[PDB]
Ligand binder design. Structure first.
Ligand SMILES: [Mg+2]
Ligand SMILES: [Zn+2]
Ligand SMILES: [Zn+2]
Ligand SMILES: [Zn+2]
Lengths: 58, 64, 463, 1044, 44, 76, 58, 138, 50
DNA sequence: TTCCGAGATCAGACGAGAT
DNA sequence: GTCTGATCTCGGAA
């Protein structure tokens, strides 16, 4: 609201509630995706495609 | 290139008024009243002679 | 191709026309963020019959009239249609049955050619009989006799009169009863995109979405036919200051400069009091900005008082079609202090912004103030500082989209696999619950009314 | 006081635009090839020390070409443009070494000095900038790079006050960066050869000054903060008992990956030492002095490397590769021109391959500058001249130090919003010079160094220390006498005009810069409040009885760079002269470039609307040169009837833009019409387009060459295959003409054959066909040999396009617009005198963009045509509105230009008046025939079996992953399967149930048992993922399931 | 096969596998003569 | 019996999705159509007449289901 | 450029075109005017189903 | 038509056809065929005493007489200079008669302009008799 | 040196003194003309030095 | 006595699309 | 050419 840019709270009530539902606040970075998702190709389609595919073969 | 033979807006025949215009500017005639001598009343047919450049005498040099 | 929200892909029915351009209605151009300045946009053609229905129902323009951030309508009038329908619903216009049946009968092609179009009875009878402008705008909302639309709307407008509900002579207060415009003129805020009380949003919620798309495709056909025969046009007479501005701007530039000469002199020659923020030479500039923004807004108010009605940039600013009252003060009266990232322009040389001024000059017109408006033309130092402040607009759009493109990517690569399941819970792909009801009430933000409430009960009861 | 603008057309005849490219190359030919021989004489070998090869001189002759043994004929530059050669001259007892390409209008090119009558027989346009080499047929410019200065003490803010001098070795072999860091309050001297951030007092004791009393006396005698140098380091030096000079070389002698007396010469290089290190110590001490007393983007720091400075970086390296291979030969055959003539390949194919592929790949200087050259954009005239004055970077925001040197509004937008600049009009990049008389006047005027006590150069006010080019040259007690005496001397002419003395009083360093590469500019000297021009001088220049260079020696015009502009009080006009004016300003419209400056009234628009035009001015579609018909270039756009603009500026006459214009000027009438002009769109009429308003001429170019192979067979151009009659194929060989090459003056449909190039494998014909979409007429067909004589043949395809719906017009103010509708003429609002408009412009482009400069062109144009006059709207001046408006009244028009029209459709008069007049609308090169595209089902790429990328390869446009989320957010599931598997990669694969892996066709090779194998349906790109995952050791073992 | 010189403009009947030099010149830019067929144009 | 008795926009899309593709493979038409050749335009005539031989299988995410006839739903 | 971010998610697509846009207010909000030359190239496989038999024959 | 240099040819046959002007503008029989309503200018107040010659130079030259009389209104181009005067703008209303216009046909020279107009009326009559015979069929 | 279409377009804009309503429209494509529909002109200019 | 905090060095990434 | 969490080495203490 500081930048104009009105938005529903129900969008932010979802983004916050995703971001903090597994114990701790999991920021949406490359690193927070590993602690949010279990499936590999969803992580592998995101950043670090090399390590996420080898580590899930290990 | 060469003089467009029409006005773009109205379409007065203006292609036959180039060497008659250049013959006027060879004399004393000022740029303004030269086009009043050729019967160019409105300005849209006046810019077809005034704003025109004649590249065709210059390209011909480089076209043996 | 820079798809930034859900509305950048939209389905469309396809009519084979005679040209090589993709031509669409200009109401749907702000969802695409598409101007016609040489922009290109792609056209996919779904092959299976299942993917044809998923385009038509889910992604049709008649379905996605409303952005899912706010609930505001994005498909609504832009530019000329707004300044067409404002000039038509303005209080002064009167049409005789010559022009009235001509403007009205523009709305009779393409699913509209089979209606007995009912001209309303005229609002002047005896001395001459003639219609009013707003009575012809009611034909947009209800052209036939057997049309079931009864639109209702009561709202404020731009240049609102402040006092008086609907009876003051400024006439910026819309009241539609049963799809008949009873008072007021159609601003941007009653026709354009971004307001939750324009008619195309009101026709959407109360009367289905086919009547909102029809009444929007009626206005796009009607309002240019009025405007091209009324001739709205801008000129340099619409930018020249009158006599009253010049004697107002001359004193404001003098009395605004006497004090800033003293406020500079009260700092260095002697003792200057300090604002609580910082020391001297920091609150001096914040007290410079107060007196210079006094100048550009009093001269901006000196301009707007003398600026005669039916002025073309004024008319484009009253209805919010293009450009606010800031741009008229910049063009005519005086464009204010050119600010670089929230301050006066920084000294690129030693203690001096440009080598024309003196060293350590904190003077106005030496650190970024431009005194001439765009009519009287900027001077070389003034043109440079306006360029310096102008490039910070251009530079920041290059770097923001370099970041918010990434921030769009990280956001959607985590948040994509959520959907509100059938028992109202919102779960992840792995079954784990994020929310127990979506957002506490289980309500669409898209269908949500203003104030984050699905109804706004004052409007429904009066409807 | 009245007329001083005349200095600018006299400056442009000498060294102003595209003459800084030329002089820089003319310096490189006539000086720099004779300063590389002095560096690289005496080719000696060790296997025989009794011979010697010694170069005397290099001459670089006139451009020639041989086609046989000894014809050695000369060449015009517009023959190398046709025969795809490279315009070059030989490099030279008195025997050739190689060949080096020559930029046009250089001192050894053909085109200099010759009249326009002689430009015809050389087939070259006289209004053509020059400054571009012709390499392998295409014409390349070396773009001006901007680098930071050399040996500059820059005080940055990495963590706290780190300073690093990026010294560049005058012996150019290396460039080192001896930065100085602060860690936990202690100074260090980090380098890239040092394995450790060593404390600075370790260096100082290694540098010969052993005692600690001397070091503080160097840094700060006045203690107040330089006492806090004390317990930082000289205690930290003393905390380990290490007071010794030889022992403190020893700590350097370990970490440097007695032996360091030499290796301290590769640290802070350009401070010179003859093993008298006293000069080196003060320069390190001044580097520490800055930190304790403590702008990377400021144009006194940015030096510009031109095309001739940049080729000398190459040719010195290519001479060395030619030089060292003479040693490799003389050490091969001794246990000499005849083993050298095959190294004519070395320079010639070294120099040319560096310009065509824009790569200085120089391992000898460790630099890999990519994209230094660019092919010239011959779209219009000014798109050629806008490339000659172009600066590429290596920040984005506009600094005010670019005032007068660079154009503020000429920039691209996108990746390079402030990184690709453009030179202004009245600028001049400097060249190098000798430093002899600079030092010789410095040591007379008063300076002293290496005998002064460490303490002197300190907080005491009278210690301004002179710095030349980054090397300290003594200290002067009185800065004013030195700055003033050098300045009087330079004006008198004893010192070179370009050298600049500037003074920074924050740190007492005066700065004599003779660098070469500094952005410079001239100003009119203001001694007392009366200027120096005196008008009568502006009259001498009128008859020519004097030249701009006579102003310099008469001390009337001074060249000022950016650094000297810190010390001046530049007055903009005559009437703003003050008590302390110093220099004045020649003509203030020269701060705009050559792409802006084209704009009339740029000082009335919002400034981000001039910048839009500087992109679109280069994109304009107009005439190119007087030789535009003999050029065969890959894409040449020509206007049918160009017109010079009605509202010219003053920069248009100096460029002679009106001699070869771009765009007509149509009578617009800004009004809202028919609602097909909403988002910047604009309505044209279908009579002006029938009368020839902006007919296009798009000229493509197709070519082929017929090479003789190593097999000694060759290519044939056998004629048409007449079938059942003399008539050629169904349409395929219809235009061939029986000599092979198609006939000039004939139309080519799609898939019609231009030449029958047939190739030996025995002959498989490779027919060069014209694809297009629409038809094209052959205009010329040229036949020649290239350098390796192989019969090249070049076509030239006319195509005229009347501008229909889609074709982008701009408006000379950045208000571009696709032509949305083309109405007939009789449906259009004629005024009283009969003039129906050409281009109805929407009036909503004005109040948000605030381009008031457009609204005056409809006034200055309309008064202009009615009087028979071209109204100057320049920048910061030109014809004012209060005199234009009283010229409409004499011809019976409205004094604002708003003319009473009556509507064309309804016949009644319009309710409001309509603004009306001629403004210069330039068509630009975005026509929808080049961009209409659809792909039903065509070629797929060979690797991933997706549709290809490009319209030239029948397209398919990427439904990107951002548009994937849009299709996700709609919830359309069956669309995405259809849009990303069905109609992109519809593949079919076979896997097996057990051991689940890709097995081909009916059975899987692993576990041959053939029973479990069950086909899947998958995208091919996912199958290619599995099969390249399984190639490395990751094995996606699919476990299928039946559809439930 | 008849070709026209670079600037000499003399019709030079060359044949195949022949250098493209010219009678009365040495210049190797040889354009081709215009076609002989009736080419129909539209005045639109 | 516990989910929403309103036909969602994702159920109207797929019911029109597959009833279009069924009727484009010569399915028996239920609406005695009046010259519509687009199979999708037939399917919206099927929906408004409420004659579509389709039952929506609504999956509660635990695994249990709940059927819903397209006759038995409230379209918009 | 790799197969994940550009060949598996953002993959090129058949039956798809691209031109320059120009306005047309005389259409309903739901309709795009498609050029003839594009509409003769982009094709829809319409199966023959007793109601478009005479239409597809025509 | 074009310019040449020696050794250059132009050889071409032409075909002329009868074309409507709306097909292409090269078929247009008239340079400009505009019209304008005849103005009539009424001085509401009598003007005299050097304000008359002020009002003389304000209008078009031939339009006025000098007291002030509006001698011949047909020659008035609508500069609208009165509103710059700030004194006479309240004095005189300027107006144009609605049912009295002034045509101005200037032919290119194909047909003489008195036969262009009598052909122009003749094809409007033919355009409505083309439709009146459509109703006679139906 | 004048391009072919631009010549052929500039031959289009030249008015022709033969009055219409002696002739009729061109019915079919009919590029041969029928001397009741068309009116042919010839232009043969070849310049030399005097 | 060991262990956990705080000093260095190391990663993969840094928007669409278009000619 | 930085912005980044991770993961390694040092060090002072109950
Ligand atoms: Mg755009
Ligand atoms: Zn005209
Ligand atoms: Zn197997
Ligand atoms: Zn010859």
């Amino acid at each position: 609201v500081n930048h104009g840019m009105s938005i529903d709270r129900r969008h932010v009530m979802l983004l916050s509630d995703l971001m903090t539902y597994k114990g701790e606040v999991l920021g949406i970075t490359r690193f927070g995706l590993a602690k949010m998702k279990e499936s590999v190709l969803m992580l592998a389609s995101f950043e670090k495609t090399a390590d996420h595919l080898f580590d899930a073969a290990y | 290139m060469i003089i467009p033979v029409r006005c773009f807006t109205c379409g007065k025949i203006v292609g036959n008024k180039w060497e008659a215009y250049l013959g006027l500017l060879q004399a004393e005639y000022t740029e303004g009243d030269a086009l009043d001598a050729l019967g160019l009343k409105r300005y849209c047919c006046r810019r077809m002679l005034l704003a025109h450049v004649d590249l065709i005498e210059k390209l011909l040099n480089y076209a043996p | 191709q820079p798809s930034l929200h859900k509305l950048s892909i939209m389905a469309h029915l396809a009519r084979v026309k005679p040209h090589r351009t993709f031509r669409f209605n200009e109401c749907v151009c702000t969802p695409y963020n598409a101007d016609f300045d040489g922009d290109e946009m792609n056209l996919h053609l779904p092959q299976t019959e299942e993917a044809k229905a998923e385009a038509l129902v889910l992604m049709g323009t008649k379905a996605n009239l409303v952005t899912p951030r706010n609930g505001e309508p994005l498909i609504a009038a832009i530019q000329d249609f707004l300044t067409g329908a404002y000039l038509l619903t303005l209080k002064d216009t009167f049409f005789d049955r010559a022009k009235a049946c001509q403007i009205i009968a523009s709305i009779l092609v393409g699913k509209d050619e089979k209606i007995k179009v009912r001209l309303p009875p005229p609002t002047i009878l005896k001395p001459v009989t003639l219609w009013t402008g707003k009575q012809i705008f009611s034909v947009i909302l209800r052209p036939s006799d057997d049309n079931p639309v009864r639109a209702n709307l009561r709202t404020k407008g731009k240049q609102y009169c402040g006092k008086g509900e609907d009876l003051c002579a400024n006439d910026s207060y819309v009241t539609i009863q049963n799809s008949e415009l009873m008072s007021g003129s159609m601003d941007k805020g009653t026709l354009g995109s971004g307001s939750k009380n324009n008619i195309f949003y009101i026709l959407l919620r109360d009367w289905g979405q086919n009547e909102a798309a029809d009444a929007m495709s009626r206005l796009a056909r009607l309002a240019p036919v009025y405007l091209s025969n009324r001739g709205f046009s801008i000129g340099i007479g619409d930018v020249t200051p009158g006599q009253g501005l010049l004697k107002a701007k001359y004193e404001l530039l003098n009395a605004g400069y006497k004090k800033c000469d003293e406020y500079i002199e009260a700092l260095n020659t002697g003792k200057l009091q300090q604002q609580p923020g910082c020391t001297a030479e920091e609150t001096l500039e914040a007290l410079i900005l107060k007196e210079l923004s006094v100048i550009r807004d009093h001269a901006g108010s000196a301009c707007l008082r003398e600026l005669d009605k039916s002025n073309s940039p004024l008319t484009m600013a009253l209805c919010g079609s293009k450009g606010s009252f800031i741009n008229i003060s910049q063009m005519i009266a005086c464009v204010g202090q050119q600010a670089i990232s929230g301050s006066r322009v920084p000294d690129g040389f030693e203690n001096r912004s440009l080598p024309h001024f003196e060293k350590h000059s904190k003077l106005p017109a030496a650190k970024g103030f431009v005194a001439n408006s765009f009519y009287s033309g900027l001077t070389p130092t003034e043109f440079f500082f306006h360029t310096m402040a102008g490039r910070e607009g251009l530079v920041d759009t290059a770097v923001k989209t370099a970041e918010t493109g990434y921030m769009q990517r990280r956001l959607v690569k985590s948040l994509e696999d959520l959907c509100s399941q059938y028992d109202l819970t919102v779960r992840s792909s792995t079954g784990d619950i994020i929310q127990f009801i979506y957002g506490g009430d289980g309500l669409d933000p898209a269908a949500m009314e203003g104030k984050d409430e699905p109804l706004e009960f004052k409007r429904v009861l009066d409807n | 006081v009245e007329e001083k603008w005349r200095l600018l057309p006299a400056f442009l005849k000498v060294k102003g635009l595209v003459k800084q490219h030329i002089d820089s190359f003319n310096y490189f030919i006539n000086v720099e090839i004779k300063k590389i021989m002095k560096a690289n004489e005496k080719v000696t070998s060790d296997a025989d020390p009794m011979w010697y090869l010694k170069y005397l001189n290099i001459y670089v002759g006139l451009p020639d070409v041989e086609e046989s043994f000894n014809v050695t004929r000369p060449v015009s530059p517009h023959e190398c443009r046709l025969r795809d050669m490279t315009y070059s001259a030989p490099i030279t007892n008195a025997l050739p070494i190689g060949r080096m390409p020559i930029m046009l209008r250089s001192s050894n090119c053909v085109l200099t000095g010759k009249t326009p009558a002689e430009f015809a027989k050389l087939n070259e346009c006289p209004l053509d900038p020059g400054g571009y080499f012709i390499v392998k047929g295409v014409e390349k410019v070396i773009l001006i790079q901007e680098q930071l200065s050399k040996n500059r003490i820059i005080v940055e803010a990495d963590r706290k006050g780190a300073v690093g001098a990026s010294v560049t070795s005058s012996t150019h072999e290396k460039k080192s960066r001896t930065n100085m860091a602060v860690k936990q309050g202690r100074f260090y001297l980090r380098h890239n050869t040092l394995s450790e951030d060593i404390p600075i007092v370790i260096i100082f004791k290694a540098m010969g000054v052993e005692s600690d009393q001397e070091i503080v006396q160097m840094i700060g005698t006045e203690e107040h903060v330089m006492a806090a140098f004390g317990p930082s380091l000289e205690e930290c030096q003393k905390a380990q008992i290490f007071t010794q000079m030889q022992a403190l070389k020893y700590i350097g002698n370990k970490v440097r990956r007695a032996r360091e007396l030499l290796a301290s010469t590769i640290l802070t290089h350009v401070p010179v030492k003859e093993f008298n290190f006293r000069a080196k110590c003060i320069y390190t001490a001044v580097m520490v002095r800055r930190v304790i007393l403590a702008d990377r983007d400021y144009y006194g720091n940015k030096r510009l490397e031109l095309a001739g400075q940049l080729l000398s970086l190459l040719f010195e390296d290519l001479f060395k590769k030619f030089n060292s291979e003479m040693k490799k030969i003389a050490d091969q055959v001794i246990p000499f021109d005849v083993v050298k003539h095959m190294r004519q390949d070395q320079i010639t194919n070294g120099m040319v391959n560096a310009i065509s592929t824009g790569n200085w790949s120089l391992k000898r200087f460790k630099m890999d500058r990519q994209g230094v050259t660019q092919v010239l954009s011959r779209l219009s005239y000014i798109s050629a001249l806008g490339m000659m004055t172009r600066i590429s970077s290596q920040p984005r925001s506009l600094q005010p130090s670019q005032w007068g040197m660079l154009c503020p509004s000429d920039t691209p937008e996108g990746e390079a919003c402030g990184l690709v600049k453009n030179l202004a009009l009245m600028t001049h990049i400097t060249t190098d010079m000798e430093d002899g008389p600079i030092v010789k006047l410095a040591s007379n005027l008063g300076v002293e160094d290496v005998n002064l006590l460490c303490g002197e150069e300190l907080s005491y006010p009278n210690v301004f220390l002179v710095f030349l080019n980054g090397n300290i040259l003594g200290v002067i007690r009185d800065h004013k006498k030195l700055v003033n005496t050098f300045r009087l001397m330079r004006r008198a002419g004893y010192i070179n005009e370009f050298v600049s003395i500037s003074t920074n009083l924050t740190d007492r360093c005066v700065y004599i810069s003779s660098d070469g590469g500094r952005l410079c500019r001239p100003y009119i000297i203001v001694k007392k409040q009366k200027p120096a021009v005196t008008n009568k001088h502006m009259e001498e220049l009128a008859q020519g009885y004097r030249n701009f260079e006579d102003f310099l020696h008469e001390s009337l015009v001074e060249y000022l760079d950016v650094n000297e502009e810190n010390d001046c009080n530049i007055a903009l006009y005559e009437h703003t002269i003050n008590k302390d004016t110093t220099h004045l300003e020649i003509e203030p419209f020269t701060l705009l470039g050559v792409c802006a400056g084209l704009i009339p009234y740029p000082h009335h628009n919002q400034s981000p609307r001039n910048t839009y035009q500087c992109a679109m001015g280069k994109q304009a579609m107009g005439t190119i040169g007087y030789n535009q018909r003999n050029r065969i270039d890959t894409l040449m756009y020509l206007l049918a009837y160009p017109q010079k603009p009605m509202v010219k500026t003053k920069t248009i006459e100096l460029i002679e833009f009106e001699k070869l214009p771009a765009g007509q000027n149509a009578t617009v009438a800004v009004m809202s019409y028919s609602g097909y002009d909403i988002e910047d769109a604009l309505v044209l009429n279908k009579a002006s387009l029938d009368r020839g308003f902006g007919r296009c001429l798009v000229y493509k170019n197709a070519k082929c060459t017929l090479k003789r192979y190593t097999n000694q067979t060759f290519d044939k151009v056998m004629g048409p295959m007449l079938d059942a009659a003399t008539r050629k194929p169904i349409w395929r060989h219809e235009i061939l003409d029986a000599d092979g090459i198609c006939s000039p003056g004939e139309k080519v449909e799609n898939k019609q054959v231009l030449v029958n190039k047939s190739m030996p494998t025995q002959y498989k014909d490779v027919p060069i066909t014209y694809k297009g979409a629409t038809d094209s007429y052959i205009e010329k067909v040229m036949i020649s040999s290239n350098a390796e004589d192989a019969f090249l043949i070049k076509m030239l395809l006319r195509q005229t396009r009347r501008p229909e719906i889609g074709d982008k017009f701009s408006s000379r103010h950045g208000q571009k617009g696709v032509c949305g509708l083309i109405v007939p003429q009789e449906d259009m609002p004629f005024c009283d005198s009969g003039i129906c408009p050409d281009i109805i412009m929407n009036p909503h482009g004005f109040p948000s963009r605030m381009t008031v400069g457009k609204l005056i062109e409809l006034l200055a144009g309309k008064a202009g045509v009615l009087d028979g006059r071209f109204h100057y709207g320049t920048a910061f001046g030109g014809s004012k509105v209060k005199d234009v408006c009283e010229d409409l009244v004499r011809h019976g028009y409205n004094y604002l230009g708003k003319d009473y029209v009556t509507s064309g459709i309804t016949g009644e008069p319009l309710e409001a008046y309509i603004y009306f007049g001629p403004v210069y609308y330039q068509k630009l090169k975005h026509m929808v025939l080049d961009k209409m595209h659809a792909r039903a089902r065509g070629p797929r790429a060979v690797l991933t079996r997706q549709p290809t990328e490009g319209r030239s390869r029948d397209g398919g446009l990427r439904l990107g992953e951002m548009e994937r989320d849009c299709l996700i957010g709609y919830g359309a599931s069956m669309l995405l399967l259809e849009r990303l598997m069905i109609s992109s990669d519809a593949f079919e694969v076979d896997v097996c149930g057990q051991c689940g892996l890709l097995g081909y066709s009916g059975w899987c090779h692993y576990c041959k048992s053939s029973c479990h194998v069950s086909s899947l349906r998958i995208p091919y790109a996912c199958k290619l993922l599995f099969q390249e995952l399984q190639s490395m050791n990751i094995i996606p073992r699919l476990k299928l399931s039946k559809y439930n | 096969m008849i070709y026209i010189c670079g600037e000499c403009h003399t019709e030079n009947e060359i044949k195949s596998r022949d250098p493209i030099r010219c009678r009365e010149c040495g210049y190797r830019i040889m354009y081709k003569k215009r076609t002989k067929r009736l080419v129909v144009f539209d005045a639109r | 019996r516990i989910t929403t008795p309103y036909m969602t926009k994702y159920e109207r899309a797929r019911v029109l999705g597959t009833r279009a593709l069924q009727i484009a493979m010569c399915a028996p038409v239920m609406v005695e159509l009046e010259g519509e050749t687009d199979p999708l335009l037939i399917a919206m005539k099927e929906l408004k007449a409420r004659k579509i031989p389709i039952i929506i299988r609504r999956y509660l995410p635990d695994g249990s289901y709940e059927d819903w006839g397209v006759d038995e739903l409230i379209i918009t | 450029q790799g197969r994940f971010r550009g060949n598996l998610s953002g993959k090129r697509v058949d039956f798809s075109g691209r031109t320059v846009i120009s306005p047309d207010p005389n259409l309903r909000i739901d309709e795009v005017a498609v050029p003839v030359h594009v509409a003769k190239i982009l094709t829809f496989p319409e199966k023959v189903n007793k109601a478009n038999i005479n239409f597809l024959r025509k | 038509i074009a310019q040449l240099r020696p050794g250059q040819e132009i050889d071409l046959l032409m075909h002329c056809v009868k074309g409507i002007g709306k097909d292409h503008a090269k078929f247009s029989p008239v340079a400009t065929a505009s019209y304008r309503l005849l103005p009539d200018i009424t001085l509401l107040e009598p003007v005299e005493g050097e304000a008359a010659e002020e009002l003389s130079r304000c209008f078009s030259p031939g339009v006025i007489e000098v007291v002030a009389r509006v001698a011949n209104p047909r020659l008035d181009t609508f500069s609208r200079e009165i509103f710059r005067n700030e004194k006479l703008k309240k004095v005189v209303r300027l107006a144009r008669v609605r049912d009295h216009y002034i045509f101005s046909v200037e032919s290119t020279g194909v047909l003489p302009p008195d036969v262009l107009v009598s052909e122009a009326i003749k094809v409007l009559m033919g355009k409505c008799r083309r439709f009146l015979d459509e109703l006679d069929a139906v | 040196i004048v391009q072919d279409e631009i010549l052929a377009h500039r031959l289009g804009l030249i008015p022709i003194h033969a009055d219409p309503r002696l002739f009729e429209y061109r019915n079919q494509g009919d590029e041969e003309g029928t001397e009741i529909d068309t009116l042919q002109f010839r232009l043969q200019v070849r310049c030399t030095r005097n």
